[PDB]
């Protein structure tokens, strides 16, 4: 299969997952998308320390089990997150220190993994243990204060608790190979593999934004870790603005690494994101597939003028007008700026540099025209492999009215039918 | 004098107003912006029929006076809206028809205008009375069903109630001259003037979006009505996406017509808008001035490479790199693509076509770099006449670190100081 992300990833033995929030499982729109598109699930918060052990020695898996059960019942594997780290610790653990904390860490690992023994594909045993100060050293936390060997102990503890799960070390800002933090983690994992410390995978948060941009060397980082004899996984992927090229680039980086088990995006819809202001996911708040969704799907499946297949004519702006509201048409192809369209990272089809292919509404018969670019979803489009061009907001296809093929035939939105008047070739 | 919208508009004897919502007056950010920028106020809902006459014969001005008092206390004039129309009628009026409704309409006009007698600059006596069906005729409402002369009667009643107020007929979709609706309204106003019916102005909602685009013939529309002997006013202006060129065009249309009294935008911040999803106003949710704000201010005030004054060097992307996160610098100006910036309608400074001048943060010293364009406010800039370039999200100026002038000098964000290292020209 290749119409959904998970199924597309499965073609190469990989998975495409998401972070599930138990509180959203009652949202039909949410579950419809999540059950259909992903085959791997990570509990967004339900399996963390405070959620699973609210009081010292008192475990609770009500929320964790609901996420786990929803996942397995809907055909998805699960990544456990997270067993031992400085963040979101319950009040009682935050106050602990020394051997007492070290013992509480061990007890927590045994309790949680024991509850889910043999049912978890991957466990983020330790996460966010390194600093961002630029030294490439450990983060100063109550756990780190118990001794530099706490991470190694956590992993040894984890292996014994559940030998069937892949044990991962997860962190962020370790994607760019030139960063000190990336090197610090690399050296630790290398040391671990050399000394025989039980670690099977390294998780890369992959939280990209202009403050910590994606860089092509992320593939090199993944390959360098894979060379150490550990699998790698993109664990919390989200990209500020959801650039189509960047999402495709990250997807292809995993596909280029044999040991990359799969990719998980941190959330379903932008409105479900912990960073919603950055609209960093693959689905909009209304549940519509974004331009980035198609870019990712295309990559997973192994994937100028815009000419209509049925007419042989090009998408044209009448008389090279730059007036907002000018409906586009079909016209004999020729070298002119009013027939030169540029597909942007945001999913727009631009002309003249700052004018956007624009849908004047959302239903069948909607006029498609040029309008000043401003970021509306009615100005975003998905370029499908079959040649159809679908409006993000409407979910409708660019359509040459009535199947017309002569010069002057107007363009509208219309239910996709795979008709020749809805298929386009880019040159 | 020329630093705020109202003051700039006053330089041509006009006003620049907004719609005020009484329920938002407790918001310090809201009132700070509103009090500072506008010299005309329209109550968004507080002076409508249901808000001023909750029961037949029982008037209530608690809501209206809160808006009125705030306006006068802050030096603004007031546009009354709206006395007789089909929308937002209280239940008791919705139940009326024929002569009973006709008298209730007259009583309402007398009651409300009497309360505000002599304190209102303009009153939208009747609003939204024409149909959008293309016939150019009247909208079917209980008022229209009382007789075609209801509008005339409303105006005659209003003149007698308060001879000091300018009486306006307000409507939408009457901006494009070619529309039947526009001409139907024109015919009515012409008839009124010819027969001596008291009408002093025509208000144009000016609600523009790709579904009902702004058209340059709007200036001829304004001119046509002005020639009838009535003033004109842009009453509820908002533009989808807040296109800078469109906002400037509309502003210039009013500035070109001597009888255009002024412009009112329908709201303060995008988040306050009745159509917030179209981010159609001049201020963002966090209260920052958008690129469109500067476009309007510039227009009211009379109306490639980016060289730094003093250094004489141009904004340059190091080694013509296209890598996200590359900090920009100053460098000898030369015909190169890694220079050549394009200011878009959305307020971006683009390079390479799809890369955006990007601020990785909001404080002083913030790195200014290139990043994929996605619409973030940290990618929007305002080009001031003094030569400064201010980041919309940060409110800080593009700054050449340490006042450096040699090649390699990095660009950052920094509190505006009018220094030569924060002044740019184009070129
Ligand atoms: C990676 O970063 C995202 C983390 O998830 C968030 O943690 C804080 C919660 O408030 C938020 O809802 C979560 O999405 C995740 O645990 C890290 O590993
Ligand atoms: C012009 O259009 C906007 C109208 O104002 C809105 O009316 C409906 C309310 O729910 C909304 O809050 C208002 O902004 C105005 O009255 C018309 O003249």
**Site of tokens 């300018």:** B166
Encoded tokens for A233: 């996984």
CA distance B396 to B20: 29
**Which fold, A1-300?**
TIM Barrel (3.20.20)
Strands A342-343 and A349-351: antiparallel
Cα A340 to chain center, whole Å?
31
CA distance A330 to A318: 9
Strands A201-204 and A231-239: parallel
Whether B369 and A344 lie within 8 Å, measured CB to CB: no
The structural domains of chain B, with segments of one domain joined by +, span 1-300, 304-425
B196 touching A (Cβ < 8 Å):
no
Angle at A166 between CA A160 and CA A171, to 5 degrees: 110
Whether A215 and B242 lie within 8 Å, measured CB to CB: no
CA distance A30 to B129: 43
State which approach was used to obtain the coordinates.
Answer: X-ray
Among partner residues A215, A344, A369, which is closest to B323 by beta-carbon distance? A215
Closest approach of B244 to chain A, Cα-based (Å): 9
B2: left (phi over 0), alpha (psi -120 to 50) or beta: alpha
Q: How many CB atoms neighbour CB A48 within 10 A?
A: 23
Encoded tokens for A67: 């996420």
A345 touching B (Cβ < 8 Å):
yes
- Ligand having the closest approach to the CA of B44: 2
Identify the DSSP state of B347. Answer: S
**Which fold, B304-425?**
Trefoil (Acidic Fibroblast Growth Factor, subunit A) (2.80.10)
- First-to-last C-alpha distance (Å) of chain A: 28
CA distance B315 to B306: 6
Q: Which long-range contacts (CB under 8 A, 24 or more apart) does A225-229 make?
A: A225/A186, A225/A189, A226/A257, A226/A258, A226/A259, A226/A260, A228/A186, A228/A189, A228/A190, A228/A193, A229/A193
Angle at A129 between CA A123 and CA A134, to 5 degrees: 140
Residues 261-300 of A with CB under 8 A from B: 278-279
Q: Give DSSP secondary structure letters for A103-164.
A: HHHHHHHHHHHHHTTT--SEEEEEES-B-SSSS--B---HHHHT-TTHHHHHHHHHHHH-TT
Q: How many CB atoms neighbour CB B427 within 10 A?
A: 9
Identify the DSSP state of B101. Answer: H
Rg (CA), chain A: 25
Q: How many CB atoms neighbour CB A84 within 10 A?
A: 25
Residues of chain A neighbouring B246 (CB-CB closer than 8 A): 324, 372
Whether B245 and A373 lie within 8 Å, measured CB to CB: no
Cβ(A42)–Cβ(A19) below 8 Å: yes
Strands A207-208 and A201-204: unpaired
A316 is in an annotated binding site: yes
Three-state helix/strand/coil letters over B246-310: HHHHHHHHHHHCCCEEEEEECCCEHHHCCCHHHCCCCECCCCCECHHHHHHHHHHCCCCCCEECC
Cβ(B178)–Cβ(B213) below 8 Å: no
A402: left (phi over 0), alpha (psi -120 to 50) or beta: left
**Site of tokens 């991962």:** A168
Nearest to B81 by CA among B39, B114, B118, B51: B51
Q: Give DSSP secondary structure letters for B19-63.
A: EE-GGGTT-HHHHHHHHHH-SEEEESSTTSHHHH-SBTTB---HH
Query: Residue B381: CB partners within 8 Å, gap ≥ 6?
Result: B291, B343, B347, B348, B349, B357, B389, B390, B391, B392, B398
CA distance A37 to A281: 13
Ligand 2 pocket test: pick from B47, B203, B274, B280 the residue with the most ligand atoms within 8 Å of its Cβ. Answer: B274
**Site of tokens 């014994």:** A160
Encoded tokens for A376: 């509306």
Angle at B269 between CA B265 and CA B270, to 5 degrees: 90
Q: Which helix (H) or strand (E) holds A180?
A: helix A180-195
Burial B87-115 (b: 16+ CB within 10 A, else e): eebbeebeebeeeebbebbbebbbbbbeb
Q: Give DSSP secondary structure letters for B305-345.
A: --EETTT-PEEE-GGG---TTPBPEEE---S-TTS--EE-T
To 10 degrees, what angle do helices A291-300 and A244-255 make? 20
HSE, side-chain direction, 13 A CA sphere, residue A312:
1
- Ligand having the closest approach to the CA of B204: 2
Identify the DSSP state of B406. Answer: S
Beta bridge partner(s), residue B110? none
């Amino acid at each position: 299969a290749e119409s959904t992300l998970g199924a597309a990833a499965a073609q190469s033995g990989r998975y495409f997952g998401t972070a599930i929030a138990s509180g959203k499982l009652g949202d039909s729109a949410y579950t419809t998308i999540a059950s259909r598109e992903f085959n791997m699930v990570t509990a967004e918060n339900e399996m963390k320390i405070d959620a699973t052990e609210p009081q010292r020695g008192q475990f609770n898996f009500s929320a964790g089990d609901r996420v786990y059960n929803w996942a397995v019942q809907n055909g998805k594997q699960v990544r456990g997150h997270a067993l031992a780290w400085h963040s979101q610790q319950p009040g009682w653990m935050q106050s602990l220190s020394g051997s007492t904390l070290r013992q509480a860490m061990i007890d927590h690992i045994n309790g949680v993994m024991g509850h889910y023994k043999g049912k978890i594909a991957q466990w983020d045993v330790v996460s966010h243990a390194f600093s961002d100060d630029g030294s490439g050293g450990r983060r100063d936390s109550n756990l780190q204060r118990t001794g530099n060997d706490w991470i190694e102990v956590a992993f040894r503890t984890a292996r014994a608790a559940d030998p069937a799960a892949k044990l991962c070390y997860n962190d962020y800002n370790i994607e760019n190979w030139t960063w000190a933090k990336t090197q610090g983690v690399y050296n630790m994992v290398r040391d671990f593999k050399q000394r025989g410390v039980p670690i099977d995978c390294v998780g890369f948060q992959s939280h990209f934004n202009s403050g910590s941009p994606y860089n092509s060397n992320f593939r090199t980082t993944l390959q360098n870790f894979a060379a150490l004899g550990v699998d790698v996984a993109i664990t919390e992927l989200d990209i500020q603005g959801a650039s189509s090229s960047t999402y495709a680039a990250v997807t292809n980086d995993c596909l280029a690494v044999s040991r990359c088990l799969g990719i998980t995006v941190w959330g379903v819809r932008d409105t479900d994101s912990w960073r919603s202001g950055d609209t960093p996911l693959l689905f909009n708040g209304d549940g519509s597939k974004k331009a980035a969704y198609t870019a990712v799907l295309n990559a997973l499946n192994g994937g100028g003028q815009i000419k209509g297949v049925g007419s042989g004519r090009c998408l044209d702006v009448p008389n090279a007008s730059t007036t907002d509201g000018t409906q586009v048409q079909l016209y004999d192809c020729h070298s002119a700026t009013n027939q030169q369209w540029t597909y942007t990272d945001a999913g727009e089809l631009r002309v003249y540099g700052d004018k956007c292919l624009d849908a004047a509404g959302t239903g069948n018969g909607t006029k498609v025209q040029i309008y000043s670019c401003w970021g509306g979803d009615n100005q975003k489009w998905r370029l499908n492999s079959d040649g159809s061009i679908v409006g993000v907001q409407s979910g409708l296809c660019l359509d040459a009215v009535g199947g017309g093929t002569a010069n002057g035939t107007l363009i509208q939105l219309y239910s996709c039918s795979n008709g020749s008047n809805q298929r386009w070739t880019r040159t």
